[PDB]
Symmetry: D2
Subunit: 116 residues, 4 copies
Protein backbone atom coordinates (compact mmCIF):
# COMPACT_ATOMS: atom_id res chain seq x y z
CA UNK A 1 0.00 0.00 0.00
CA UNK A 2 2.81 2.38 0.77
CA UNK A 3 4.60 2.08 -2.59
CA UNK A 4 2.91 1.64 -5.93
CA UNK A 5 4.35 1.90 -9.41
CA UNK A 6 2.23 2.68 -12.50
CA UNK A 7 3.53 2.57 -16.04
CA UNK A 8 1.79 3.81 -19.21
CA UNK A 9 2.60 3.41 -22.93
CA UNK A 10 2.42 6.65 -24.90
CA UNK A 11 2.64 4.86 -28.24
CA UNK A 12 -0.33 2.46 -27.68
CA UNK A 13 -2.35 4.61 -25.32
CA UNK A 14 -2.51 1.75 -22.86
CA UNK A 15 -1.14 0.52 -19.61
CA UNK A 16 2.43 -0.81 -19.98
CA UNK A 17 1.90 -4.43 -18.96
CA UNK A 18 4.56 -6.87 -17.77
CA UNK A 19 7.14 -4.19 -17.09
CA UNK A 20 9.83 -5.39 -14.65
CA UNK A 21 10.51 -3.09 -11.73
CA UNK A 22 13.37 -3.42 -9.21
CA UNK A 23 13.49 -1.33 -6.04
CA UNK A 24 16.71 -0.77 -4.11
CA UNK A 25 17.48 1.01 -0.85
CA UNK A 26 20.72 2.73 -0.06
CA UNK A 27 22.65 0.94 2.71
CA UNK A 28 24.86 2.37 5.42
CA UNK A 29 27.90 1.68 3.26
CA UNK A 30 26.36 3.55 0.30
CA UNK A 31 25.63 0.45 -1.82
CA UNK A 32 22.22 -0.18 -3.35
CA UNK A 33 20.61 -3.12 -1.50
CA UNK A 34 17.83 -5.02 -3.32
CA UNK A 35 14.57 -4.10 -1.59
CA UNK A 36 11.81 -5.48 -3.65
CA UNK A 37 10.74 -6.26 -7.24
CA UNK A 38 7.82 -7.21 -9.39
CA UNK A 39 6.00 -6.79 -12.73
CA UNK A 40 3.21 -4.45 -13.77
CA UNK A 41 -0.21 -6.02 -14.12
CA UNK A 42 -2.65 -5.75 -17.02
CA UNK A 43 -3.61 -2.35 -15.51
CA UNK A 44 0.00 -1.14 -15.65
CA UNK A 45 0.19 -1.18 -11.87
CA UNK A 46 2.46 -2.88 -9.41
CA UNK A 47 1.18 -3.25 -5.91
CA UNK A 48 2.47 -5.33 -3.01
CA UNK A 49 6.09 -4.32 -3.18
CA UNK A 50 6.43 -3.61 0.53
CA UNK A 51 4.70 -3.09 3.83
CA UNK A 52 4.54 -0.04 6.11
CA UNK A 53 6.84 -1.89 8.58
CA UNK A 54 9.44 -2.74 5.97
CA UNK A 55 9.33 0.63 4.16
CA UNK A 56 11.46 2.59 6.58
CA UNK A 57 13.10 5.93 5.99
CA UNK A 58 15.83 5.83 3.38
CA UNK A 59 16.93 6.66 -0.12
CA UNK A 60 15.14 4.40 -2.60
CA UNK A 61 15.75 3.71 -6.26
CA UNK A 62 12.93 2.44 -8.46
CA UNK A 63 14.39 0.99 -11.64
CA UNK A 64 11.82 0.46 -14.39
CA UNK A 65 13.05 -1.89 -17.09
CA UNK A 66 11.87 0.09 -20.09
CA UNK A 67 14.34 -1.40 -22.56
CA UNK A 68 12.88 -4.89 -22.39
CA UNK A 69 9.34 -3.49 -22.89
CA UNK A 70 10.06 -1.60 -26.15
CA UNK A 71 12.20 -4.37 -27.57
CA UNK A 72 9.37 -6.91 -27.12
CA UNK A 73 7.13 -4.74 -29.16
CA UNK A 74 9.67 -4.29 -32.04
CA UNK A 75 11.07 -0.97 -30.91
CA UNK A 76 14.73 -0.91 -30.13
CA UNK A 77 14.48 1.98 -27.60
CA UNK A 78 16.96 4.62 -26.45
CA UNK A 79 17.16 4.26 -22.68
CA UNK A 80 18.40 1.28 -20.71
CA UNK A 81 15.88 1.86 -17.95
CA UNK A 82 14.16 4.66 -16.12
CA UNK A 83 15.62 5.23 -12.62
CA UNK A 84 13.60 7.14 -9.99
CA UNK A 85 15.64 8.00 -6.86
CA UNK A 86 14.09 9.68 -3.80
CA UNK A 87 14.18 9.95 -0.07
CA UNK A 88 11.10 8.35 1.52
CA UNK A 89 9.40 8.46 4.91
CA UNK A 90 11.70 11.00 6.43
CA UNK A 91 8.77 12.86 8.06
CA UNK A 92 6.97 9.73 8.93
CA UNK A 93 5.13 7.23 6.78
CA UNK A 94 3.74 8.36 3.44
CA UNK A 95 2.13 6.59 0.52
CA UNK A 96 3.99 6.90 -2.76
CA UNK A 97 2.87 6.37 -6.31
CA UNK A 98 5.68 6.45 -8.85
CA UNK A 99 4.25 6.88 -12.33
CA UNK A 100 6.09 6.62 -15.63
CA UNK A 101 4.89 7.42 -19.16
CA UNK A 102 6.99 5.68 -21.78
CA UNK A 103 7.94 6.39 -25.36
CA UNK A 104 10.82 4.83 -27.25
CA UNK A 105 13.10 7.90 -26.99
CA UNK A 106 11.51 9.63 -24.01
CA UNK A 107 9.87 9.13 -20.64
CA UNK A 108 8.32 11.18 -17.94
CA UNK A 109 7.97 10.33 -14.34
CA UNK A 110 6.00 11.85 -11.51
CA UNK A 111 5.36 11.11 -7.87
CA UNK A 112 2.10 11.39 -5.99
CA UNK A 113 2.75 11.46 -2.25
CA UNK A 114 -0.10 11.25 0.21
CA UNK A 115 -0.23 11.26 4.01
CA UNK A 116 -2.45 8.46 5.39
CA UNK B 1 12.27 36.78 -33.01
CA UNK B 2 9.69 37.04 -30.26
CA UNK B 3 7.99 33.68 -30.98
CA UNK B 4 9.49 30.32 -31.94
CA UNK B 5 7.87 26.91 -32.01
CA UNK B 6 9.88 23.72 -31.64
CA UNK B 7 8.45 20.23 -32.18
CA UNK B 8 10.13 16.95 -31.25
CA UNK B 9 9.29 13.29 -31.92
CA UNK B 10 9.49 10.96 -28.88
CA UNK B 11 9.11 7.77 -31.01
CA UNK B 12 12.08 8.43 -33.28
CA UNK B 13 14.14 10.67 -31.07
CA UNK B 14 14.31 13.40 -33.64
CA UNK B 15 13.01 16.78 -34.62
CA UNK B 16 9.45 16.63 -35.99
CA UNK B 17 9.99 17.90 -39.51
CA UNK B 18 7.41 19.44 -41.85
CA UNK B 19 4.75 19.81 -39.15
CA UNK B 20 2.10 22.45 -39.93
CA UNK B 21 1.74 25.07 -37.22
CA UNK B 22 -0.97 27.75 -37.12
CA UNK B 23 -0.97 30.68 -34.72
CA UNK B 24 -4.14 32.60 -33.93
CA UNK B 25 -4.82 35.71 -31.88
CA UNK B 26 -8.04 35.98 -29.85
CA UNK B 27 -10.25 38.76 -31.20
CA UNK B 28 -12.49 41.11 -29.20
CA UNK B 29 -15.55 38.97 -30.07
CA UNK B 30 -13.73 35.83 -28.68
CA UNK B 31 -13.13 34.26 -32.10
CA UNK B 32 -9.64 33.11 -33.17
CA UNK B 33 -8.11 35.17 -35.97
CA UNK B 34 -5.28 33.82 -38.06
CA UNK B 35 -2.02 35.40 -37.05
CA UNK B 36 1.03 33.38 -38.49
CA UNK B 37 1.72 29.93 -39.76
CA UNK B 38 4.38 27.71 -41.25
CA UNK B 39 5.96 24.26 -41.35
CA UNK B 40 8.72 23.13 -39.00
CA UNK B 41 12.18 22.94 -40.50
CA UNK B 42 14.65 20.07 -40.54
CA UNK B 43 15.57 21.11 -36.99
CA UNK B 44 11.91 20.88 -35.86
CA UNK B 45 11.75 24.65 -35.52
CA UNK B 46 9.65 27.35 -36.92
CA UNK B 47 11.16 30.81 -36.82
CA UNK B 48 9.98 34.00 -38.48
CA UNK B 49 6.36 33.82 -37.37
CA UNK B 50 6.07 37.40 -36.20
CA UNK B 51 7.94 40.53 -35.31
CA UNK B 52 8.23 42.46 -32.09
CA UNK B 53 5.98 45.17 -33.54
CA UNK B 54 3.17 42.79 -34.41
CA UNK B 55 3.32 40.51 -31.30
CA UNK B 56 1.38 42.61 -28.86
CA UNK B 57 -0.07 41.50 -25.58
CA UNK B 58 -3.04 39.23 -25.90
CA UNK B 59 -4.17 35.63 -25.94
CA UNK B 60 -2.58 33.42 -28.61
CA UNK B 61 -3.24 29.87 -29.73
CA UNK B 62 -0.62 27.71 -31.37
CA UNK B 63 -2.19 24.74 -33.14
CA UNK B 64 0.21 21.98 -34.15
CA UNK B 65 -1.04 19.50 -36.77
CA UNK B 66 0.11 16.37 -35.00
CA UNK B 67 -2.42 14.08 -36.70
CA UNK B 68 -1.00 14.70 -40.18
CA UNK B 69 2.50 14.30 -38.90
CA UNK B 70 1.79 10.81 -37.48
CA UNK B 71 -0.30 9.82 -40.53
CA UNK B 72 2.58 10.67 -42.88
CA UNK B 73 4.78 8.26 -40.86
CA UNK B 74 2.14 5.60 -41.18
CA UNK B 75 1.26 5.75 -37.50
CA UNK B 76 -2.33 6.09 -36.03
CA UNK B 77 -2.50 8.86 -33.47
CA UNK B 78 -4.95 9.83 -30.79
CA UNK B 79 -5.23 13.61 -30.98
CA UNK B 80 -6.65 15.77 -33.76
CA UNK B 81 -3.96 18.37 -33.04
CA UNK B 82 -2.13 19.86 -30.11
CA UNK B 83 -3.24 23.35 -29.08
CA UNK B 84 -1.23 25.61 -26.82
CA UNK B 85 -3.11 28.69 -25.56
CA UNK B 86 -1.36 31.40 -23.55
CA UNK B 87 -1.23 35.09 -22.79
CA UNK B 88 1.66 37.23 -24.08
CA UNK B 89 2.60 39.60 -21.20
CA UNK B 90 4.96 42.57 -21.65
CA UNK B 91 5.98 42.47 -17.94
CA UNK B 92 7.66 39.08 -18.47
CA UNK B 93 10.69 38.23 -20.60
CA UNK B 94 10.57 39.10 -24.33
CA UNK B 95 11.25 35.90 -26.21
CA UNK B 96 8.87 32.93 -26.22
CA UNK B 97 9.70 29.39 -27.26
CA UNK B 98 6.71 27.06 -27.35
CA UNK B 99 8.06 23.51 -27.39
CA UNK B 100 6.09 20.31 -27.98
CA UNK B 101 7.21 16.68 -27.54
CA UNK B 102 5.00 14.30 -29.49
CA UNK B 103 4.01 10.68 -29.03
CA UNK B 104 1.03 8.99 -30.74
CA UNK B 105 -1.18 9.02 -27.62
CA UNK B 106 0.51 11.79 -25.61
CA UNK B 107 2.17 15.14 -25.87
CA UNK B 108 4.03 17.51 -23.58
CA UNK B 109 4.39 21.24 -24.02
CA UNK B 110 6.45 23.83 -22.20
CA UNK B 111 7.24 27.49 -22.59
CA UNK B 112 10.75 28.84 -22.34
CA UNK B 113 10.45 32.60 -21.88
CA UNK B 114 13.65 34.60 -21.79
CA UNK B 115 15.24 38.07 -22.24
CA UNK C 1 -17.48 5.10 -17.09
CA UNK C 2 -16.64 5.78 -20.69
CA UNK C 3 -14.82 9.07 -20.13
CA UNK C 4 -12.66 9.90 -17.14
CA UNK C 5 -10.31 12.81 -16.60
CA UNK C 6 -7.39 12.69 -14.13
CA UNK C 7 -5.25 15.68 -13.26
CA UNK C 8 -1.98 15.71 -11.27
CA UNK C 9 0.14 18.55 -9.82
CA UNK C 10 3.84 18.24 -10.58
CA UNK C 11 4.77 21.00 -8.13
CA UNK C 12 3.03 19.46 -5.04
CA UNK C 13 3.25 15.82 -6.01
CA UNK C 14 -0.46 15.45 -5.47
CA UNK C 15 -3.72 15.11 -7.25
CA UNK C 16 -4.90 18.43 -8.73
CA UNK C 17 -8.15 18.89 -6.83
CA UNK C 18 -11.07 21.12 -7.82
CA UNK C 19 -9.91 21.56 -11.39
CA UNK C 20 -12.78 22.61 -13.69
CA UNK C 21 -13.16 20.55 -16.84
CA UNK C 22 -15.47 21.34 -19.79
CA UNK C 23 -16.11 18.82 -22.56
CA UNK C 24 -17.42 19.85 -25.97
CA UNK C 25 -18.43 17.88 -29.04
CA UNK C 26 -18.12 19.11 -32.58
CA UNK C 27 -21.55 19.66 -34.19
CA UNK C 28 -22.61 19.18 -37.78
CA UNK C 29 -22.05 22.88 -38.42
CA UNK C 30 -18.50 22.68 -37.02
CA UNK C 31 -19.23 24.57 -33.77
CA UNK C 32 -18.21 23.20 -30.39
CA UNK C 33 -21.39 22.15 -28.52
CA UNK C 34 -21.19 21.90 -24.71
CA UNK C 35 -21.26 18.20 -23.85
CA UNK C 36 -20.52 17.89 -20.23
CA UNK C 37 -18.53 19.45 -17.35
CA UNK C 38 -17.39 18.91 -13.83
CA UNK C 39 -14.60 19.30 -11.24
CA UNK C 40 -11.84 16.93 -10.18
CA UNK C 41 -12.31 15.27 -6.82
CA UNK C 42 -9.83 15.02 -3.94
CA UNK C 43 -8.25 12.13 -5.93
CA UNK C 44 -7.75 14.36 -8.97
CA UNK C 45 -10.36 12.38 -10.89
CA UNK C 46 -13.54 13.32 -12.63
CA UNK C 47 -16.01 10.56 -13.23
CA UNK C 48 -19.65 10.68 -14.31
CA UNK C 49 -19.26 13.02 -17.25
CA UNK C 50 -21.30 10.90 -19.64
CA UNK C 51 -22.92 7.57 -20.34
CA UNK C 52 -22.22 4.97 -23.05
CA UNK C 53 -25.53 5.98 -24.73
CA UNK C 54 -24.72 9.68 -24.77
CA UNK C 55 -21.04 9.29 -25.73
CA UNK C 56 -21.52 8.70 -29.41
CA UNK C 57 -18.90 8.91 -32.12
CA UNK C 58 -17.57 12.40 -32.67
CA UNK C 59 -14.74 14.84 -32.20
CA UNK C 60 -14.48 15.83 -28.54
CA UNK C 61 -12.59 18.60 -26.82
CA UNK C 62 -11.67 18.29 -23.15
CA UNK C 63 -10.75 21.71 -21.80
CA UNK C 64 -8.96 21.61 -18.45
CA UNK C 65 -9.00 24.94 -16.68
CA UNK C 66 -5.39 24.99 -15.56
CA UNK C 67 -5.11 28.77 -15.21
CA UNK C 68 -7.57 28.98 -12.34
CA UNK C 69 -5.77 26.14 -10.50
CA UNK C 70 -2.29 27.75 -10.50
CA UNK C 71 -3.62 31.20 -9.71
CA UNK C 72 -5.40 29.89 -6.59
CA UNK C 73 -2.17 28.56 -5.32
CA UNK C 74 -0.22 31.85 -5.91
CA UNK C 75 1.25 30.92 -9.26
CA UNK C 76 0.29 33.11 -12.14
CA UNK C 77 0.72 30.37 -14.80
CA UNK C 78 1.55 30.49 -18.51
CA UNK C 79 -1.29 28.65 -20.25
CA UNK C 80 -4.94 29.62 -20.34
CA UNK C 81 -6.06 26.00 -20.28
CA UNK C 82 -5.04 22.62 -21.57
CA UNK C 83 -7.17 21.48 -24.55
CA UNK C 84 -7.30 17.78 -25.52
CA UNK C 85 -9.05 17.17 -28.87
CA UNK C 86 -9.69 13.66 -30.23
CA UNK C 87 -12.03 11.52 -32.23
CA UNK C 88 -13.87 9.02 -30.00
CA UNK C 89 -15.86 5.83 -30.54
CA UNK C 90 -15.34 5.64 -34.24
CA UNK C 91 -14.71 1.86 -34.09
CA UNK C 92 -17.34 1.30 -31.52
CA UNK C 93 -17.46 2.16 -27.85
CA UNK C 94 -14.22 2.58 -25.96
CA UNK C 95 -13.32 3.76 -22.48
CA UNK C 96 -11.12 6.83 -22.35
CA UNK C 97 -8.97 8.22 -19.59
CA UNK C 98 -7.55 11.66 -20.33
CA UNK C 99 -4.71 12.41 -17.94
CA UNK C 100 -2.91 15.71 -17.47
CA UNK C 101 0.21 16.51 -15.42
CA UNK C 102 0.44 20.19 -14.61
CA UNK C 103 3.26 22.62 -13.94
CA UNK C 104 3.03 26.39 -14.11
CA UNK C 105 4.79 26.69 -17.49
CA UNK C 106 4.24 23.18 -18.82
CA UNK C 107 1.81 20.28 -19.04
CA UNK C 108 1.68 16.83 -20.43
CA UNK C 109 -1.33 14.88 -21.43
CA UNK C 110 -1.88 11.26 -22.31
CA UNK C 111 -4.79 9.04 -23.20
CA UNK C 112 -5.44 5.50 -22.05
CA UNK C 113 -7.99 3.85 -24.32
CA UNK C 114 -9.44 0.47 -23.45
CA UNK C 115 -11.98 -1.77 -25.18
CA UNK C 116 -14.66 -3.06 -22.77
CA UNK D 1 29.94 18.08 -30.31
CA UNK D 2 28.61 14.56 -30.04
CA UNK D 3 26.87 15.05 -26.65
CA UNK D 4 24.88 18.01 -25.32
CA UNK D 5 22.66 18.22 -22.27
CA UNK D 6 19.83 20.73 -22.01
CA UNK D 7 17.85 21.37 -18.82
CA UNK D 8 14.62 23.36 -18.55
CA UNK D 9 12.52 24.57 -15.60
CA UNK D 10 8.75 23.92 -15.88
CA UNK D 11 7.93 26.10 -12.81
CA UNK D 12 9.55 29.28 -14.10
CA UNK D 13 9.42 28.65 -17.81
CA UNK D 14 13.12 29.14 -18.23
CA UNK D 15 16.40 27.42 -18.79
CA UNK D 16 17.67 25.66 -15.65
CA UNK D 17 20.90 27.53 -15.05
CA UNK D 18 23.93 26.37 -13.06
CA UNK D 19 22.72 22.77 -12.76
CA UNK D 20 25.51 20.24 -12.09
CA UNK D 21 25.63 17.42 -14.60
CA UNK D 22 27.85 14.34 -14.33
CA UNK D 23 28.37 11.84 -17.13
CA UNK D 24 29.63 8.33 -16.45
CA UNK D 25 30.60 5.45 -18.71
CA UNK D 26 29.84 1.87 -17.67
CA UNK D 27 33.06 -0.07 -17.09
CA UNK D 28 33.69 -3.75 -17.86
CA UNK D 29 33.12 -4.64 -14.17
CA UNK D 30 29.67 -2.87 -14.29
CA UNK D 31 30.76 0.11 -12.19
CA UNK D 32 30.20 3.70 -13.38
CA UNK D 33 33.39 5.58 -14.24
CA UNK D 34 33.45 9.34 -14.40
CA UNK D 35 33.50 10.53 -17.97
CA UNK D 36 32.62 14.35 -18.20
CA UNK D 37 30.88 16.92 -16.12
CA UNK D 38 29.93 20.56 -15.95
CA UNK D 39 27.29 23.13 -15.04
CA UNK D 40 24.53 24.26 -17.38
CA UNK D 41 24.96 27.69 -18.89
CA UNK D 42 22.58 30.64 -18.93
CA UNK D 43 20.82 28.90 -21.82
CA UNK D 44 20.36 25.70 -19.76
CA UNK D 45 22.89 23.91 -21.94
CA UNK D 46 26.07 22.11 -21.38
CA UNK D 47 28.31 21.78 -24.39
CA UNK D 48 31.91 20.60 -24.59
CA UNK D 49 31.50 17.42 -22.58
CA UNK D 50 33.34 15.14 -24.95
CA UNK D 51 34.77 14.75 -28.41
CA UNK D 52 33.96 12.39 -31.23
CA UNK D 53 37.20 10.50 -30.54
CA UNK D 54 36.42 9.89 -26.89
CA UNK D 55 32.65 9.16 -27.19
CA UNK D 56 32.78 5.54 -28.22
CA UNK D 57 29.94 3.08 -28.18
CA UNK D 58 28.89 2.00 -24.75
CA UNK D 59 26.45 2.62 -21.94
CA UNK D 60 26.44 6.15 -20.50
CA UNK D 61 24.70 7.70 -17.52
CA UNK D 62 23.90 11.38 -17.29
CA UNK D 63 23.14 12.40 -13.72
CA UNK D 64 21.51 15.81 -13.30
CA UNK D 65 21.64 17.34 -9.81
CA UNK D 66 18.02 18.42 -9.67
CA UNK D 67 17.83 18.45 -5.86
CA UNK D 68 20.45 21.19 -5.51
CA UNK D 69 18.84 23.17 -8.26
CA UNK D 70 15.43 23.23 -6.49
CA UNK D 71 17.05 23.82 -3.07
CA UNK D 72 18.88 26.89 -4.37
CA UNK D 73 15.48 28.30 -5.47
CA UNK D 74 14.11 27.62 -2.03
CA UNK D 75 11.85 24.85 -3.28
CA UNK D 76 11.56 21.29 -1.75
CA UNK D 77 11.87 18.62 -4.41
CA UNK D 78 11.08 14.96 -4.58
CA UNK D 79 13.98 13.37 -6.43
CA UNK D 80 17.61 13.05 -5.36
CA UNK D 81 18.67 13.57 -8.98
CA UNK D 82 17.55 12.66 -12.46
CA UNK D 83 19.53 9.90 -14.16
CA UNK D 84 19.39 9.20 -17.87
CA UNK D 85 21.01 5.92 -18.93
CA UNK D 86 21.40 4.98 -22.60
CA UNK D 87 23.55 3.19 -25.13
CA UNK D 88 25.60 5.17 -27.67
CA UNK D 89 25.26 3.30 -31.01
CA UNK D 90 27.42 4.10 -34.06
CA UNK D 91 24.71 2.80 -36.46
CA UNK D 92 22.39 5.64 -35.44
CA UNK D 93 22.83 9.38 -35.99
CA UNK D 94 25.99 11.05 -34.61
CA UNK D 95 24.84 13.87 -32.37
CA UNK D 96 23.00 13.32 -29.09
CA UNK D 97 21.02 15.90 -27.17
CA UNK D 98 19.77 14.69 -23.79
CA UNK D 99 17.05 17.09 -22.69
CA UNK D 100 15.38 17.26 -19.27
CA UNK D 101 12.30 19.25 -18.20
CA UNK D 102 12.17 19.69 -14.44
CA UNK D 103 9.35 20.14 -11.95
CA UNK D 104 9.67 19.60 -8.17
CA UNK D 105 7.86 16.23 -8.19
CA UNK D 106 8.30 15.23 -11.84
CA UNK D 107 10.70 15.26 -14.73
CA UNK D 108 10.63 14.40 -18.41
CA UNK D 109 13.60 13.43 -20.53
CA UNK D 110 13.99 12.88 -24.25
CA UNK D 111 16.80 12.23 -26.66
CA UNK D 112 17.16 14.11 -29.91
CA UNK D 113 19.62 12.15 -32.05
CA UNK D 114 20.61 13.64 -35.37
CA UNK D 115 23.23 13.68 -38.19
O1 LIG E 1 -0.31 10.59 -17.47
C1 LIG E 1 0.31 10.24 -16.46
C2 LIG E 1 -0.38 9.55 -15.32
C3 LIG E 1 -0.02 9.37 -13.99
C4 LIG E 1 -0.89 8.63 -13.14
O2 LIG E 1 -0.61 8.41 -11.84
C5 LIG E 1 -2.05 8.12 -13.68
O3 LIG E 1 -2.96 7.39 -12.98
C6 LIG E 1 -2.28 8.38 -15.01
N1 LIG E 1 -3.22 8.02 -15.74
O4 LIG E 1 -4.11 7.26 -15.25
O5 LIG E 1 -3.15 8.30 -17.08
C7 LIG E 1 -1.46 9.07 -15.80
C8 LIG E 1 1.75 10.45 -16.33
C9 LIG E 1 2.54 9.47 -15.78
C10 LIG E 1 3.89 9.70 -15.65
C11 LIG E 1 4.50 10.87 -15.99
C12 LIG E 1 3.71 11.83 -16.59
C13 LIG E 1 2.33 11.63 -16.78
F1 LIG E 1 1.58 12.57 -17.35
O1 LIG F 1 12.28 17.87 -24.30
C1 LIG F 1 11.78 18.98 -24.52
C2 LIG F 1 12.61 20.09 -25.15
C3 LIG F 1 12.33 21.45 -25.14
C4 LIG F 1 13.21 22.35 -25.77
O2 LIG F 1 12.94 23.70 -25.78
C5 LIG F 1 14.33 21.85 -26.41
O3 LIG F 1 15.24 22.63 -27.05
C6 LIG F 1 14.51 20.48 -26.35
N1 LIG F 1 15.45 19.78 -26.86
O4 LIG F 1 16.37 20.34 -27.58
O5 LIG F 1 15.31 18.41 -26.70
C7 LIG F 1 13.67 19.61 -25.74
C8 LIG F 1 10.35 19.21 -24.23
C9 LIG F 1 9.55 19.93 -25.08
C10 LIG F 1 8.24 20.16 -24.76
C11 LIG F 1 7.65 19.66 -23.60
C12 LIG F 1 8.46 18.86 -22.79
C13 LIG F 1 9.80 18.66 -23.09
F1 LIG F 1 10.57 17.86 -22.32
Amino acid sequence: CPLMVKVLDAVRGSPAINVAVHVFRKAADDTWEPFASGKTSESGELHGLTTEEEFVEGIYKVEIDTKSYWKALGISPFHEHAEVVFTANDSGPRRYTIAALLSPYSYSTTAVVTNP
